[PDB]
Design a protein around this ligand. Structure first.
Ligand SMILES: COc1ccc(/C=C2/C(=O)Nc3ccccc3C(=O)N2C)cc1
Ligand SMILES: COc1ccc(/C=C2/C(=O)Nc3ccccc3C(=O)N2C)cc1
Ligand SMILES: O=C(O)CCC(=O)C(=O)O
Ligand SMILES: O=C(O)CCC(=O)C(=O)O
Ligand code: NI
Ligand code: NI
Lengths: 287, 287
């Protein structure tokens, strides 16, 4: 059985339910090729600069990602297309509100562009959040997902060039004795298509076997506002933050957050008042 | 059986173990009367101003606390004694590192001064974090505490003036059919003494029965850096933040955080670098 494929527009209401059941779904045309085109140009440089994940100058080195991997996060000040189009995506917000209504508000735990060099090896089968949020390992096995991961194709995803592997149903697995590449199916996708998975879905990047092609993706980890992001937007110029929608500002942590609790007392408040009120934060001011 | 009483200095090593077993411990002389004296003077005004918890002008009103309650959080810019002495307390840090080593780094989820007016009613028996972090309700019942609460007496705590009630052992209770005021004991404390409880310890503020006395306390909720604080320090003047120790800065969220995971990739990082590095953040610069 292959990964369910759904229309971003016509099947929007079916997307989260499908992921809730199977643990994965391909969203066809999640982003328009226009947005993909612009985003690829805006991050195009920043990919080639980034040192090796475990670079000596980095004070928080990533010792897990392969040396043939390049990751660039904190995209707001880099990409207009990201901070305007992606962070206000009607599809992304309908899915996230469907997934996280039991917990309350959500934000970006990490938005990053990943580029795999040719002959990049397959990643080991894994669950996300294990190198950042140990707490997730202590949740009851039937606890609803506290984070989801949109893996958006910025280049063609094929069997040969290392398209993502997933084990359908693996988000409900307590016993991991069955975990093997034998149990996986491939996320074959065009640029703008998105693989949506949960923090419990067992998956891995495929092997780049062409020796010529470079695979690029935008990974958006959306999580509940009760969990700390992997990335900080604190250093983002205030003119850039004031150029965003109020909703985009909230996703980057430049706003107070609410829990779903009946009499919610809130998160990141200042004596009963919000970040954005206290600091007189403007919205949608052009640069 | 009464709440175990321990010396902050001589019994430091026994404090967390005692709380781990019984769910509560009185730390005698947690703060020196000097620090208590200064703190009481520095917050003295801010207590009397604060509107009712559910004030109309507040965009995050607190609908839970009684109208005869006054709470003031974000103490860093208010109190020198707080941001210098309390946030660098050797006792607090030994306890927190003992409690949270399995999860990793910790910070202040909320530091607040609470003042109860005379004839203030007793709070209902409760567990903390239920109006902010629903996720805590989805943790396995044997999961180690992800937050603890230091309730520091800034005025004498007596049976008559509404000293805190606790049910010893209640942090391990799955079945809550036994919960009643009949099962509680009192936290009788002098100024500078601290009641330490977990997020699972069932407790409540006592009834102020004198009709004359005002009870004041400093509540410090210390939690793992994977959970979002209730309070934001984002609006704190940068000169004030640069006047703090690096450790104090981390506790207020003006630094990147680390998980206990073997190959930790970190929290609130900026392309492999920390907040404090990226923004050229100084430490211990006098005002
Ligand atoms: C080679 O084996 C791996 C390498 C990485 C992971 C998983 C993670 C992770 O938990 N979170 C994210 C989320 C988005 C993008 C990257 C990462 C990441 O870097 N790590 C460490 C697993 C297995
Ligand atoms: C009258 O009944 C109550 C009122 C409050 C709580 C509990 C909380 C809470 O979960 N967290 C804190 C932590 C420190 C200080 C105050 C609070 C607070 O305001 N609330 C809402 C319970 C029961
Ligand atoms: O490259 C991929 O398709 C998977 C990436 C991933 O799962 C990860 O980096 O955690
Ligand atoms: O006033 C007290 O002693 C208890 C306060 C408290 O538990 C609370 O506000 O949550
Ligand atoms: Ni992954
Ligand atoms: Ni309480």
């Amino acid at each position: 059985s292959q990964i369910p494929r759904l229309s971003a527009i016509n099947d929007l209401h079916k997307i989260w339910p499908t992921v809730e059941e199977h643990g994965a779904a391909i969203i066809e045309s999640f982003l328009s090729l226009d947005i993909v085109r612009r985003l690829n140009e805006e991050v195009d440089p920043f990919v080639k600069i980034e040192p090796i994940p475990a670079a000596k100058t980095k004070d928080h080195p990533n010792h897990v990602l392969s040396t043939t991997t390049r990751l660039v996060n904190v995209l707001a000040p880099i990409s207009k297309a990201y901070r305007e189009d992606v962070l206000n995506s009607k599809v992304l917000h309908r899915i996230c509100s469907d997934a996280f209504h039991v917990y309350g508000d959500y934000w970006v735990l990490m938005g990053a562009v990943m580029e795999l060099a040719p002959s990049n090896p397959a990643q080991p089968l894994h669950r996300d959040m294990r190198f950042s949020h140990p707490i997730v390992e202590y949740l009851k096995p039937d606890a609803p997902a506290t984070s989801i991961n949109f893996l958006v194709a910025l280049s063609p995803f094929t069997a040969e060039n290392g398209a993502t592997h997933v084990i359908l149903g693996s988000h409900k697995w307590q016993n991991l004795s069955n975990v093997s590449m034998d149990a996986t199916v491939r996320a074959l996708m065009n640029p703008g298509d998105a693989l949506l998975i949960t923090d419990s879905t067992i998956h891995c990047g495929g092997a780049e076997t062409t020796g010529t092609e470079t695979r690029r993706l935008l990974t958006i980890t959306m999580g509940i506002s009760q969990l700390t992001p992997l990335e900080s937007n604190l250093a983002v110029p205030r003119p850039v933050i004031e150029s965003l929608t109020p909703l985009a500002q909230r996703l980057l942590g430049w706003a107070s957050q609410r829990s779903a609790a009946p009499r919610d007392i809130g998160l990141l408040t200042i004596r009963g008042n919000s970040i954005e009120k206290t600091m007189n934060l403007k919205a949608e001011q052009p640069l």
